[PDB]
């Protein structure tokens, strides 16, 4: 049944299954820290866009949903973030004109080295 689709699924199954087996066997010989499981949670917490915070707290206080009212809630924040990204890519960010986009995509300005030391 359309092997041209089965082969990527086969390699994907292999990769993901090997990763899961590895993490399993790795947190057995080394049990995970009972507190830095919160630290990795904080690390992934620091990476979420802002368009989702208006939903996030709403999930803590019950208000949010049953199970699907949520799944259609995340789509709105998602598409808001998506259209913001389209705008930033094409016409620029929130605080930069067209010249700043030109110097961004021409790589005229080095990463600031003097400041970081």
């Amino acid at each position: 049944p359309r092997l041209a689709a089965v082969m990527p699924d086969a390699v994907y199954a292999l990769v993901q299954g090997t990763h899961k087996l590895g993490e399993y066997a790795h947190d057995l010989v080394f049990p995970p820290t009972p507190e830095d499981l919160r630290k990795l949670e904080q690390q992934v917490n620091a990476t979420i866009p802002r368009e989702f915070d208006r939903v996030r707290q709403r999930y803590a206080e019950g208000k949010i949903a049953n199970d699907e009212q949520l799944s259609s809630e995340l789509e709105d924040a998602s598409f808001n973030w998506y259209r913001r990204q389209l705008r930033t890519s094409v016409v620029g960010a929130t605080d930069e004109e067209l010249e700043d986009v030109a110097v961004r995509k021409l790589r005229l300005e080095p990463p600031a080295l003097q400041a970081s030391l």
Binding site: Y12, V15, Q16, T18, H19, G22, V29, F30
Partner: protein, 70 residues
Amino acid sequence: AWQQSFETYGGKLREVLLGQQEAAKNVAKQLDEGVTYMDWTYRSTGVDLSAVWDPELWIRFREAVAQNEP
């Protein structure tokens, strides 16, 4: 049935592996660098597997399963 014995093997080998922590990271380095380029194969088995082996594909496999990105 492998899970029941695997539970007893886990804690049994965990301390034995946590003890050394230096040989355990020397043998792992040697084993990985030796499976990457299979250049030990001629002197040990007679078949020179380094002619058909692709180190880049193995390195990419390793990094893919390390990052979970097929």
